[PDB]
Every structure is written in structure tokens, then in C-alpha cells.
Amino acid sequence: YCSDCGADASQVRGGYCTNCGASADRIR
Ligand SMILES: [Co+2]
Numbered sequence: 001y002c003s004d005c006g007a008d009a010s011q012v013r014g015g016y017c018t019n020c021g022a023s024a025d026r027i028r
Contacts, residue, residue, distance in 0.1 A: 003028050 001009055005020035015024045 001028060002026055 004022040007019040
């Protein structure tokens with residue numbers, strides 16, 4: 001999940017969370 005917004009990890013693309021724009025490393 002994205003620690004910043006809670007989006008499912010499947011929503012990360014291009015090095016960012018596609019919901020909140022968090023950088024990749026915020027995924028946990
Ligand atoms: Co996010």
C-alpha cells in the first residue's frame with residue numbers, strides 16, 4: 001500500500017503512486 005494515501009500497491013506506475021504522487025519508496 002501507499003503509506004501516504006493508502007492506495008493499493010498495484011496503483012504505482014512510473015516511480016510514483018498514481019493517486020497521491022508519492023515517490024516509489026513510500027510504498028510499503
Ligand atoms: Co499514494
